[PDB]
Amino acid sequence: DLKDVYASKVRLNASEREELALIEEAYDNPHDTLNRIKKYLLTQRVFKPVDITMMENYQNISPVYSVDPLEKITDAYLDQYLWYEADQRKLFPNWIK
Amino acid sequence: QNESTADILKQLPHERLQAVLEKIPEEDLEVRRLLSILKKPEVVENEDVQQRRIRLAEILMVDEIDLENIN
Amino acid sequence: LGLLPKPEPKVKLSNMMSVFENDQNITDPTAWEKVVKDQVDLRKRKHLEENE
Amino acid sequence: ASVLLPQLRTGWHVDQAIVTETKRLVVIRFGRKNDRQCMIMDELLSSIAERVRNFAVIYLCDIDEVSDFDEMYELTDPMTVMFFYHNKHMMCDFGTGNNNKLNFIVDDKQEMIDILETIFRGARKNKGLVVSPYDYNHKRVS
Amino acid sequence: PSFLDQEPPAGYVPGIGRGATGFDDEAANVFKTLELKLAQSNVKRQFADLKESLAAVTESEWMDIPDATDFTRRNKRNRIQEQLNRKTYAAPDSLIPGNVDLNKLTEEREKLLQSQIDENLVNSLSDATLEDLQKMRTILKSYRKADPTNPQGWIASARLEEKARKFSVAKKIIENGCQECPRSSDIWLENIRLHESDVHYCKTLVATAI
Amino acid sequence: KALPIPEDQPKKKRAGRKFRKYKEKFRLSHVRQLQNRMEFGKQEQTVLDSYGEEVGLGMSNTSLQQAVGATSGSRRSAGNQAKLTKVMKHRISEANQQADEFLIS
Amino acid sequence: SASHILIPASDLSWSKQTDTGITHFRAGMTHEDEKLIPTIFRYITTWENEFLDSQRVWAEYATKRQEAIQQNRRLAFEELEGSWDRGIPRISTLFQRDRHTLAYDRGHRIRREFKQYSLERNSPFWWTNSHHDGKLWNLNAYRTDVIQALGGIETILEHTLFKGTGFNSWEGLFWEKASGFEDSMQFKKLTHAQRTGLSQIPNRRFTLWWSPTINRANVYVGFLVQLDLTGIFLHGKIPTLKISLIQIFRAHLWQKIHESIVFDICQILDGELDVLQIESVTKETVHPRKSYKMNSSAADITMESVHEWEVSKPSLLHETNDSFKGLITNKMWFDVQLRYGDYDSHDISRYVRAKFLDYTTDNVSMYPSPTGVMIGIDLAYNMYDAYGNWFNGLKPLIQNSMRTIMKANPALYVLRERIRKGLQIYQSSVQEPFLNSSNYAELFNNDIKLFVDDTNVYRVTVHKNVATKAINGCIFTLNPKTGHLFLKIIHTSVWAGQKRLSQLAKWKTAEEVSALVRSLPKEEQPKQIIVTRKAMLDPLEVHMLDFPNIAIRPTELRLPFSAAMSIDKLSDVVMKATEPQMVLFNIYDDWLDRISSYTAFSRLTLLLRALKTNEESAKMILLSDPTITIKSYHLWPSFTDEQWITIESQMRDLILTEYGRKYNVNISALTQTEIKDIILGQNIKAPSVKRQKMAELEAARSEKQMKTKTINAQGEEIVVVASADYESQTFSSKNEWRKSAIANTLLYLRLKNIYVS
RNA sequence: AUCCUUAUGCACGGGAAAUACGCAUAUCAGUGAGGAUUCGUCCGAGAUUGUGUUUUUGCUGGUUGAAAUAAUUAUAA
């Protein structure tokens, strides 16, 4: 889901290369990455700032929240996990779309 | 020719130091004594005698003072 | 300024194939082998003569 | 403006200011200096001047005390921008139809730096006319 | 600033100075008189009276002003954003959207996961283009007509055009290849596999095959 | 800070394993060039990503390859492969050290 | 197209240039007969139909699934054909192989639907996923039906200048994408202005491609200016198209094309001579500005006759029933009138007709004879036509003449080539990079790869053509790094088919490579396979579709491996071998231990090049020394190190000896030419006679810093003008005093043999 | 005398990166810069500012439509 954005552009910038580098390191070392993920879920309550570009549709604008790609890994895995467990345990009733 | 190779070479900072290293004698008590009088650190963490001599040269280069000027 | 001789390329067993600056790299293959191996062993032997 | 940008007093300051600089690129402007259109170009050419200092240069020229160069370069206009390199008029190709001078305002600093860079390129390449990277056909064409 | 301070020496009529390139009286007065006869802010004021309230500031207070000191640090942040935007890069070769599959991906890297733990203890591609499939058909026509006796000749083109056409036309050229081949059983096995029937046709396939 | 004077320079040449790696991460690889090449007559092979459909593969895949639709790994350049920055390598080193600390505790 | 678009008969018609003649296919489309750009509405299926369709295909899929469970067989894709594309989701995404992991993916609709706040770039496909759902639209029919909607590919091309690129047909041609060049040059230190103006290239490529229909009198209806030093008329001004056209016509290419074609006709007429009954063929001295001066013209080639000629009425290069009794003329003149046409004026025949009549009849244009042929060529469309008075025997040989010129002309291929450089069009050739002297620098990346040589797979020996017998073949594939040699022994009986021997040798050889690489494990699996000859790249890829990860590189380097059958024992085991046998030789053993693999491959290449160039000598060096012995399992004549040095030096002296003695060139050359001589020479790359003459036409007059008197026509004026540059191309081949007078010396030889009936 | 531990310099070799490496008549900094935490406390070294280069720094090699054959004097009239 994080590489979905980077499969397109042939020319990556610095930040995109940092994120893709993190993701490739996550494929290379899942055990070290997953243990890095569980560590953040149990521990860190203090996080690095979020720089925000504005999504502009000309009808309405804002926001775009750009998170440090390191925390984006933990948020992505946590999201996938919460949706898998939630949809497995039927937390969301059928009427929620 | 203009800007002779000896003038540029002597103007070069390293070789200009190396010419001063040739003017300093190499002895333990005399090399050490010149540092003691010069008030610079007498011995550094770990140095060979030649390296202490190099520190002589460098200190005489930065301070713009020669051996005849010191003593 | 030209007081020192211009340095040659530093060959290795890996840089062996990729150095065309000196001759015979292909033209004289085993002689070239003796040049690169003799040059590497010459830098190593010079190192040992320095430590010694 | 009128702080960083030197204001050329008379036609002798204009002429001499053009002739002195071989290395840099002389950018002269002409405007009533009370007009909104030339005022915007001034307040742009202050920061643009600070950016293009190393190569180009900016000079304020009103038409009040100087009527001389009007008869020469055919200037009436709300405003005009003239370029000179090696004491030679630098012709700049926009989509306006006027290659000699540009009478139109540009709103982008990086853009103005781009066209100064461009006319500097053609200038060093000695070409009389250089093609501006942008068009400015439908923009102003005043 | 030098030429600015030099002042004009009377004047050079600068038009001819650097060689610039150009790329009765009573009557006039009368017609001017004819033209004449026929031709016939607040917040700034607040800035002005505040300018008058300025008068309490002495020149000794003027000589001292806290110049500059930009509190936004847009100089630093401008330098950092610039450093970030200077260069970019080229995307690696793993971003060509072949993607393989999450099967080879997951079952590939989960055995790497188990290895590390034990040490610590058609895809989305567009449809095949007709001209390309024509090149396929010609090439495989050649490799089939080379040796009709080769079973892998009709098997390779069998599966290979079988993916392209997907249909009983390719299945038929496979069958004719089975008519040319028969002494090899492999073409009959792949033949039966590329036919779909429970009994009717496939049992006959087995009959001829044996 | 004023921009540098817009003068063209030969920029010398260089070369070499050292500089071909560092320059290799920047230079478009051969498969990227083949992706930049698109066939005249036939519709080019196009991967539509879940993010967007705009991605073409150009001629990067061989004809036969394009018919089978298995794409390729082809030549895999490890030189232009994405790598971490220094700050990120250090931060991840801290993250893995601390992770092992929690594995011990 | 989302809108209603009608295509007028204005742009429909397409014309084709054939050797049999020029053909024109005209619209004639009125009222009931018309073409329309198809809107998407015809293609996108309505929702209600897609959902009813959906429940139908899911129901039938459930039934077919139940039946498959009944008979205990997995659902087949092609048995599930019919609808593979219908339903929401599509049954395709049930049979996608990642269905397991994607099935472990949930919350994806809200994730991507909610994703706009995480990312920046806007892709409004958020309402679905390609994985979970499918391709919810098939536009592949839109492209085909828009192509068919406009006149076919040929009609699409007529609006372009593709005809001028000079290709017989579109087969392997490819493009360089906008992001292709923009990303290619994007990497460099460049100012933002350099970035924008450097990104202004793609729409210049596009402007040039469609430039014939983009630049048109019917379109612009405005002031018409003629581009400087060229024959193009630019309707309106397109700043990109002007720079592109000047770039293509750089360095007086227009007048080089005119003078080149005229000189071609002269060189042909110097052979036409008495066959056409010519007195003299004289290329006139013409003002250089005449070529691109459209207002007035003059006779390019004056043609003087032995006797009076019978010329017919004005006609076309390809016609029938021409009665030449119409007129009589002593003198003849040819005129080459070049034009760059747009889509409306694309017809060359009508143009050359009307212009011929104009210049011949009226105004300033002067011709020495009232009867002549005006030849003309439309460069954009590469068309050619000749209109004028013809006499017996001329017309067919001028047809073959124009055919040969259009096929190959130096100046015309300079134009076509510069156009190809402008459009970034290139012929396919091979995707993978060739192996030349440059790439040979690294054959060792530590990436294992193989060398494949099929040359010897089919061998027949002949003694004294009295006896022709087949020999057991082989397939020669070696790995330099590991040193191993995989060599297959092909048995003569396999060739009993005796039909399509060349076509069979290649597929059968590729079979061995396939089964071989498949036999190798993942560790020794070669990442590249370099074929010596360029044929096998087509057969191999078929067998390489299995494992895509491995690249096939054809080499321009000519490898000695074809002569690898010259080694004594290696050739002995092949003849002694009977059936096909895959055999592993170790061709690096002694010096695999002593010296590096690259040096090993360079010296082995040396031995095999000397062995290929001279067999008897190279064998004489090996078996010359009695003291040395050839061990059984070593197979090479094991030497000491210095002895290897001397032997390899002598092999070098052998390659240079037989090379310089055969091709008779003294051996000094350079070190680089020495390398390329020992190994490759880039397949011995020599630019041909064409490439030489065209390299002359391309090159500018090196040093920019005679005079001829000419009469020229200004606007409504006639002025004598001094000219310059080159008008000096002259034919005068077999005619006048020079050639016959020089030919007179040989006349004493005609009396050595004297006979009468 | 042999062996071993730390640091430094010298270098053979093997790699990795240069989006990083620096500099400062600048400010502050173990007299605590800068961060973590289980809330008890723990780690202890640079941080701020400005600025140079940074799809690179110094040299080489090959290929190439980038380009680059001396002077002198002899007939019988």
The DSSP result for F28-87, as a single string, is --HHHHHHHEEESSSPPEEB--SS-S--EEET-S-HHHHHHT-----S--SSSS----HH
- For chain F, the residues whose C-beta falls within 8 A of a C-beta of chain A are 28, 32, 35-36, 47, 49-52, 54-55, 81-85, 88, 91-92, 95-96, 98-100, 102-103
In chain D, count H helices and then E strands: 4, 6
Instruction: Using CB atoms, pick whichever of G104, G116, G183 lies closest to residue A55.
Output: G116
Answer left, alpha or beta for residue G542, where phi above 0 means left and psi between -120 and 50 means alpha: alpha
* Residue G456 near residue G505 (C-beta atoms within 8 A): no
DSSP H or E segment with residue G83 = none
D98 CA to H60 C1', in Å?
51
F34, F49, F86, best to mutate vs chain A, most A CBs in 10 Å: F49
Instruction: Using CB atoms, pick whichever of G193, G239, G243 lies closest to residue D118.
Output: G193
For residue G588, give both structure tokens.
Answer: 């690096």
Three-class SS of G528-581: EEEECCCCCHHHHHHHHCCCCCCEEEEECCCCHHHHHHHCHHHHHHHHHCCCCE
- Per the structure, the complete domain to which residue D25 belongs is given by 1-140
Give SS3 for D74: coil
Q: Give the closest residue to E93 by CA, choosing from F80, F20, F24.
A: F80
Cα G86 to Cα G58: distance, rounded to the nearest angstrom: 9
Q: At what angle do helices G641-662 and G615-624 cross, to 10 degrees?
A: 160
Amino acid at E130: L
* Residue G378 near residue G339 (C-beta atoms within 8 A): yes
Q: Which nucleotides of H are covered by protein (CB under 7 A)?
A: 7-21, 36-38, 48-63, 65, 67-68
Beta strands in chain A (DSSP E): 51-53, 64-66
* Residue B35 near residue B41 (C-beta atoms within 8 A): yes
Alpha helices by DSSP H, listed for G79-198, are: 92-95, 99-103, 108-113, 140-147, 152-159, 162-165, 178-184, 192-198
Q: Is the Cβ pair A13, E88 closer than 8 Å?
A: yes
- Burial code (b: 16+ CB inside 10 Å, e: under 16) for F24-51 equals bbebbbbbbbbbbbbbbebbbbbbbbbb
Distance of CA G641 to the CA centre of its chain: 49
CATH of the domain at D132: 3.40.30.10
Q: At what angle do helices G671-678 and G641-662 cross, to 10 degrees?
A: 90
C41 CA to H12 C1', in Å?
9
DSSP H or E segment with residue E46 = helix E42-53
Cα A2 to Cα A4: distance, rounded to the nearest angstrom: 5
* CA-CA-CA-CA torsion sign (G358, G361, G364, G367): positive
Cα G732 to Cα G284: distance, rounded to the nearest angstrom: 10
Cα G215 to Cα G161: distance, rounded to the nearest angstrom: 11
Cα G88 to Cα G400: distance, rounded to the nearest angstrom: 63
Q: Which residue has the tokens 């053609």?
A: D122
Sheet containing strand G372-378, edge to edge, reads: G278-283, G301-311, G327-339, G372-378, G383-388, G315-316
Concatenating the DSSP letter of every residue in chain B gives: --S-HHHHHHHSHHHHHHHHHHHS---HHHHHHHHHHHTS-SS-SS--HHHHHHHHHHHHHHTT--HHHH-
Distance of CA D84 to the CA centre of its chain: 8
What is the C-alpha R_g of chain E?
46
Amino acid at E186: D
Helix, strand, coil % (nearest 5) of chain D?
Answer: 35, 20, 45
Q: At what angle do helices B49-62 and B28-38 cross, to 10 degrees?
A: 30
Q: How many other C-beta atoms can be found within 10 angstroms of the C-beta atom of residue G316?
A: 19
Amino acid at A52: I
- Burial code (b: 16+ CB inside 10 Å, e: under 16) for G528-557 equals bbbbbbebbbbbbbbbbbeebebbbbbbbb
What is the C-alpha R_g of chain D?
14
Q: Give the closest residue to E171 by CA, choosing from E195, E151, E189, E153.
A: E195
Name, in order, each residue with C-beta under 8 angstroms of G361's C-beta and a sequence gap of 6 or more: none
* Residue G244 near residue G398 (C-beta atoms within 8 A): no
Length of chain E: 210
Q: Cβ contacts (< 8 Å) between G176 and chain F: which residues?
A: 36-37
Helix, strand, coil % (nearest 5) of chain A?
Answer: 50, 10, 40
Q: Give the closest residue to E190 by CA, choosing from E174, E176, E204, E203.
A: E174
E89, E101, E154, E201, best to mutate vs chain G, most G CBs in 10 Å: E101
Q: Give the closest residue to G269 by CA, choosing from G260, G258, G261, G278.
A: G278
Half-sphere exposure of E127 (CA within 13 A, CB side): 16
Amino acid at G642: E
What is the C-alpha R_g of chain B?
14
For residue G90, give both structure tokens.
Answer: 């599509």
Answer left, alpha or beta for residue G338, where phi above 0 means left and psi between -120 and 50 means alpha: beta
Length of chain A: 97
Q: Cβ contacts (< 8 Å) between D48 and chain G: which residues?
A: none
List the Cα angle G687/G693/G699 in 5-degree steps: 100
G138 in reach of chain E (CB within 8 A): yes
Q: How far apart are the first and last CA of chain E?
A: 106
* Residue D7 near residue D62 (C-beta atoms within 8 A): yes
What is the C-alpha R_g of chain F?
21
* Residue of chain F whose alpha carbon sits nearest to that of E138: F64
Name, in order, each residue with C-beta under 8 angstroms of E148's C-beta and a sequence gap of 6 or more: E154, E177, E180, E181
Q: Is the Cβ pair F102, A42 closer than 8 Å?
A: yes
* Residue G402 near residue G375 (C-beta atoms within 8 A): yes
Phi, psi (deg, nearest 5) at residue G303: -130, 115
Query: What are G486's strand-pairing partners?
Result: G477, G584
**F56 CA: distance to closest CA in chain E (Å):** 9
Give SS3 for G109: helix
Instruction: Using CB atoms, pick whichever of F32, F50, F51 lies closest to residue A10.
Output: F32
List chains touching A (3+ CB pairs under 8 A).
E, F, G
Q: Which residue has the tokens 């069979």?
A: G504
Cα E204 to Cα E192: distance, rounded to the nearest angstrom: 10
Q: Is the Cβ pair A79, G179 closer than 8 Å?
A: no
Amino acid at G174: F
Helix, strand, coil % (nearest 5) of chain G?
Answer: 40, 15, 40
Going from the C-alpha of G145 to that of each of D20, G140, G231, G652, the distances in angstroms are 67, 9, 37, 64
For residue A7, give both structure tokens.
Answer: 């499969």
What is the total count of domains within chain D? Answer: 1
Q: Is the Cβ pair G648, C27 closer than 8 Å?
A: no
* Residue G552 near residue G544 (C-beta atoms within 8 A): yes
* Residue G250 near residue G358 (C-beta atoms within 8 A): no
Cα A13 to Cα E100: distance, rounded to the nearest angstrom: 25
Amino acid at E187: I
Cα G62 to Cα G77: distance, rounded to the nearest angstrom: 15
Give SS3 for D57: strand
Concatenating the DSSP letter of every residue in chain C gives: --SSPPP-----TTTTTT--SSTTTTTSHHHHHHHHHHHHHHHHHHHHHHH-
* Residue G123 near residue F49 (C-beta atoms within 8 A): no
Phi, psi (deg, nearest 5) at residue D84: -145, 135
Name, in order, each residue with C-beta under 8 angstroms of G248's C-beta and a sequence gap of 6 or more: G208, G415, G418, G419, G422
* Residue of chain F whose alpha carbon sits nearest to that of D52: F2
Beta strands in chain D (DSSP E): 25-31, 56-59, 79-85, 88-89, 91-93, 129-131
* Residue F60 near residue F66 (C-beta atoms within 8 A): no
Going from the C-alpha of G196 to that of each of D134, G186, G193, the distances in angstroms are 8, 10, 5
Instruction: Note if the bond before A63 is cis, omega within 30 degrees.
Output: yes
Name, in order, each residue with C-beta under 8 angstroms of G247's C-beta and a sequence gap of 6 or more: G418, G422
Query: What are G283's strand-pairing partners?
Result: G301
Q: Give the closest residue to D51 by CA, choosing from F1, E77, E80, E76.
A: F1
Cα A22 to Cα F83: distance, rounded to the nearest angstrom: 8
Alpha helices by DSSP H, listed for G551-688, are: 568-576, 590-594, 597-613, 615-624, 641-662, 671-678
Cα E14 to Cα E5: distance, rounded to the nearest angstrom: 18
- Burial code (b: 16+ CB inside 10 Å, e: under 16) for G495-523 equals beeeeeeebbbbbbbbbbbbebbeeeeee
Q: Are strands G315-316 and G383-388 parallel, antiparallel or unpaired?
A: antiparallel
Residue pairs between chains C and G whose CB atoms are closer than 8 Å = 55
Looking at residue D62, the DSSP 8-state letter turns out to be B
In chain E, count H helices and then E strands: 12, 0
Amino acid at G448: I
Name, in order, each residue with C-beta under 8 angstroms of E22's C-beta and a sequence gap of 6 or more: D72, D73, D74
Three-class SS of E69-111: CCCCCHHHHHHHHHHHHCCCCCCCHHHCCCCCCHHHHHHHHHH
For residue G668, give both structure tokens.
Answer: 């000094």
Q: Is the Cβ pair E125, F69 closer than 8 Å?
A: yes
For residue E98, give both structure tokens.
Answer: 């072949």
Instruction: Note if the bond before G89 is cis, omega within 30 degrees.
Output: yes
For residue E22, give both structure tokens.
Answer: 């150009």
For residue G39, give both structure tokens.
Answer: 């809107």
Cα F81 to Cα A24: distance, rounded to the nearest angstrom: 9
Cα G186 to Cα E90: distance, rounded to the nearest angstrom: 10
* Residue D13 near residue E8 (C-beta atoms within 8 A): yes
* Residue G297 near residue G284 (C-beta atoms within 8 A): no
What technique determined this structure? Answer: cryo-EM
Q: Which residue has the tokens 């321009």?
A: G556
Q: How many other C-beta atoms can be found within 10 angstroms of the C-beta atom of residue D142?
A: 12
